[PDB]
């Protein structure tokens with residue numbers, strides 16, 4: 471039940487206790503980032519590549535019946551027109567634009583293509599490979615029947631009505647989610663040697679997806695319609711694992727949301743409940759670094775656990791959420807990771823969930839470090855988003871002079 475012991479985020483690798491925010495920021499945070507890079511996700515080999523190019527391919531000022539401006543942007547990772555790229559979809563609420571104010575942004579990757587997040591027939595159909603599990607796909611390619619096929623996870627009209635822009639990119643633009651996807655990924659292009667077997671500490675899909683989120687943020691910093699200092703990075707499940715790693719590595723993200731990210735996301739690995747290190751690496755060998763396989767059936771040897779990933783978001787707001795029936799993600803483990811990260815949030819004057827057991831369903835708990843568990847199976851629902859929008863309202867207010 472409790473057959474593990476966690477490393478203390480506030481004890482340095484040399485045993486010295488971290489007593490102050492400066493030691494956390496300038497020594498302990500780099501230590502932990504290097505541990506997760508080497509042992510779990512793999513190294514992010516560079517941040518912004520030189521020669522990133524942003525091309526707005528479509529712009530509609532009266533999308534969604536006039537409610538939004540919709541922009542599609544190709545973010546190309548080098549100057550040569552042949553360089554790899556990703557396709558960003560952005561809806562911005564026209565009520566905010568009309569007031570001549572920059573909108574805060576929710577940014578997250580999608581599972582099956584930009585055209586799946588909303589029925590809107592003007593969104594470009596992805597030309598990229600799509601998994602067999604994608605609704606209404608045909609031989610691994612998008613079809614018009616797939617439009618809006620993942621819209622329940624994306625309540626665009628509500629987010630816009632609440633004053634937030636919505637930005638998304640298909641994860642498969644960055645690394646196709648298939649065990650062979652790394653060879654057709656931006657990793658195959660970025661700081662790679664002669665294309666053979668990747669190195670032990672080389673990043674995999676989660677690292678690549680996370681890097682893509684930071685490149686989307688680079689684009690948002692240039693877009694006059696949005697406030698790139700108020701970007702909430704979010705993800706569901708495997709894309710929440712990526713949102714957490716993006717938010718931990720890139721402290722420009724103003725707020726981070728993990729929706730049911732489970733093993734190698736928010737859930738403690740040392741708890742051995744639901745999905746385990748061996749199970750995740752065996753089924754998804756491209757997700758983590760090869761070095762993470764050292765801990766298959768040996769989670770006791772992990773030098774970190776996921777509470778320390780959560781702690782890397784501090785002092786910025788972080789929301790971890792679970793589903794009651796989602797045993798595979800280990801909801802208790804996700805909550806206990808929040809509780810074990812809370813001392814770092816407290817060092818920074820924030821507060822986490824009250825209580826030392828999982829709260830009752832649909833009752834969020836915590837300040838800037840917040841948790842809820844909703845009824846039902848794994849997914850991302852309107853109820854999850856209602857809670858996330860309330861959190862963002864509290865923790866993403868436009869900055870005024872201090």
Ligand SMILES: O=C(O)[C@H]1O[C@H](O)[C@H](O)[C@@H](O)[C@@H]1O
Pocket residue numbers: 706707708709730731732733745750798848
């Ligand atoms: O992406 C999802 O929904 C989930 O898919 C699989 O079940 C995987 O085992 C999980 O780690 C992941 O979170």
Ligand SMILES: [Mg+2]
Pocket residue numbers: 732733737738739741742743744745746798799800803
């Ligand atoms: Mg688990």
